[PDB]
Write the structure tokens for this entry.
Amino acid sequence: SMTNKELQAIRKLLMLDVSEAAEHIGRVSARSWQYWESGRSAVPDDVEQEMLDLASVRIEMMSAIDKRLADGERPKLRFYNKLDEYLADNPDHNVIGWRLSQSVAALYYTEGHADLI
Amino acid sequence: GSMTNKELQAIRKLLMLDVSEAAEHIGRVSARSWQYWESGRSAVPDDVEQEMLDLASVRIEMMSAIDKRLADGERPKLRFYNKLDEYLADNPDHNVIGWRLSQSVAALYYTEGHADLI
Ligand SMILES: [Cl-]
Ligand SMILES: [Cl-]
Ligand SMILES: [Mg+2]
Ligand SMILES: [Mg+2]
Ligand SMILES: [Mg+2]
Ligand SMILES: [Mg+2]
């Protein structure tokens, strides 16, 4: 029962642009995605579940870094600012995985735990 | 002053700032100048770095109060504002930067499963 504001919140947390979420998750125009965030139309079940699954991936990514911190390591995390460079290192990923990687790396940098390269 | 261009972009995005908002309020520069700081074309100014680190500290303070409610077994209802003026009505001594920080905190706890958004 994700609301319009909850969709927007998770989309922003995952560092997706509207156009990226619209193209790949919604398979709709950016305008149609904006309508789900504005509440003009209900958030589709399939879109809700996909946002939740992507959040679960992000959690798995964080649990792994947490173990490195528990070991005393100060990780050097890749912050890719070029999609093509992310994809060259992750040939089976796409723009969604790129944004997830940014969200995770930014969290640990901002918390003071990791350095970005 | 050791924050890199990518670290600036990372913290700016984590705090949910649009480039234009960061440029106007934190940089006191054009959007293009802020973009140059994120792309590496121009060095990140020391004072910009410090304001961004200070904003991260503000965000930590905001999260610590929520964490204490979670420790009591509460499921908070966090306000997710999607209009600046509605945030300001409840937070009249704040600005657009404060609004974005409030979104970043509410979105974190909602996405991690601990809070509902209203
Ligand atoms: Cl609304
Ligand atoms: Cl609140
Ligand atoms: Mg691989
Ligand atoms: Mg450093
Ligand atoms: Mg206040
Ligand atoms: Mg609910």
Helices of chain B lie at 5-14, 19-27, 31-39, 46-71, 84-90, 96-111. Chain B has one domain: 5-117. DSSP finds six helices and two strands in chain B. The pocket of magnesium ion (ligand 6) is lined by residues A 1; B 116 (CB under 6 Å).
